[PDB]
Amino acid sequence: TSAVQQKLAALEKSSGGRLGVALIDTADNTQVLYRGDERFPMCSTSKVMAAAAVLKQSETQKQLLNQPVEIKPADLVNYAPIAEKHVNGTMTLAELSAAALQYSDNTAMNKLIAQLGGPGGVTAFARAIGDETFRLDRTEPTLNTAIPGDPRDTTTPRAMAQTLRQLTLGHALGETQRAQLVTWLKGNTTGAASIRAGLPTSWTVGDKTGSGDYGTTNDIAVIWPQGRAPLVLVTYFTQPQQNAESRRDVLASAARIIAEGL
Numbered sequence: 001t002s003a004v005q006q007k008l009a010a011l012e013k014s015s016g017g018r019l020g021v022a023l024i025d026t027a028d029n030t031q032v033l034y035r036g037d038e039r040f041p042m043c044s045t046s047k048v049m050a051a052a053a054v055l056k057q058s059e060t061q062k063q064l065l066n067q068p069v070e071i072k073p074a075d076l077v078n079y080a081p082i083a084e085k086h087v088n089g090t091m092t093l094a095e096l097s098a099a100a101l102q103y104s105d106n107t108a109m110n111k112l113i114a115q116l117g118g119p120g121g122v123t124a125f126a127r128a129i130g131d132e133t134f135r136l137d138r139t140e141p142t143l144n145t146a147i148p149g150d151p152r153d154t155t156t157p158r159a160m161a162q163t164l165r166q167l168t169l170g171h172a173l174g175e176t177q178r179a180q181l182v183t184w185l186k187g188n189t190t191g192a193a194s195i196r197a198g199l200p201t202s203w204t205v206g207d208k209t210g211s212g213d214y215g216t217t218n219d220i221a222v223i224w225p226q227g228r229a230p231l232v233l234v235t236y237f238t239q240p241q242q243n244a245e246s247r248r249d250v251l252a253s254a255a256r257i258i259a260e261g262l
Contacts, residue, residue: 002032004032004257005034008021008257011254011257012034015239015247017215017238018035018237019235019236019237020034020035020156020234020236020237021033021035021157021234021254021258022036022158022160022233023231023233024161024165024233026229026230027228031161032258032261034157035157036156036157037158038156039151040154040156040236040237040238041144041145041150041154041212041216042134042154042155042210042218043144043153043211043212044104044209044212045208045209045218045219045220045234046109046122046143046210047101048101048167048181048185049122049125049126049134050113050116051097051101051112051181052172052181053112053116053121054093054112055097055177056125056177058093058177059174059177064093064115065094066092066094067092067093068091069091069092069115071083071086071088071089071090071091071107071111072088073087075107075110077110077141078106078141079106079107081099081105082103082105082108083105083107083111091111093111093112097112101184101185102188102189102190103190106140109140113136123135129167130166131155131162132159133155133158133159133160134159134160134163135151135154137152137153144213146213147214148238148240157236161220161234164232164234165222168206168222169232182222184206185222186204188207190209191207191208193252194207194209194217194235194248194251194255195207195221195233195235197248197251197252198251198253198259199255202225202226203223203224203226205221205223206221207219207220213242214238214239214242214244215239215244215245217238217250218251220233221234233258235250235255237250237251
């Protein structure tokens with residue numbers, strides 16, 4: 001198969017879990033996949049699709065991103081690092097999108113989902129841009145249960161890499177919305193130990209991580225080496241035990257395998 005695939009299989013075996021990888025190299029439109037068509041729980045990587053769905057709405061709802069949204073006491077969930085500062089006040093949808101993407105704020109994610117009419121509104125956006133695989137079924141925090149065999153709140157590495165390419169480098173969004181998504185992803189504060197940790201420090205990265213039960217540890221990224229056409233890299237990882245620890249090192253290792261194979 002390929003040497004990269006052998007190394008990814010060996011990393012998976014050593015890790016004890018199940019690893020999914022999809023790479024798109026936009027320099028030559030080549031791809032590398034490992035368990036590319038298996039479903040994995042997305043956890044917070046689904047915040048990218050929700051933010052993008054609201055950006056898409058903002059293309060024709062010209063005041064949507066600056067609309068004040070009430071942060072009510074009942075909106076606060078377990079992890080609301082930004083929204084908690086705004087209880088009984090308002091945040092705009094742009095501020096909620098930035099908080100979801102850059103701090104993985106779950107209340108902010110739930111506000112995006114509510115704007116879109118529920119989890120099905122995020123899925124509807126996926127379908128509208130040609131992603132038939134993505135499904136969001138629940139809100140935060142229960143979308144992170146990551147139960148083996150449960151198809152809710154899953155996608156495949158292949159589908160997510162294709163969609164992330166369309167959203168950030170292609171034409172699923174209008175030009176200014178695409179640039180806004182890229183700006184937000186590049187400002188992510190939660191990714192240093194995941195894909196970023198496996199790449200040369202000079203490469204620019206925009207990414208979103210996710211974590212959940214069953215030691216689920218995910219990262220989806222767009223990667224710009226200096227002066228080079230970018231790479232899109234998705235790495236999903238999940239483990240057999242419900243209480244398994246996070247394994248961001250596995251994602252870094254997968255990224256290092258990919259980076260050395262460039």
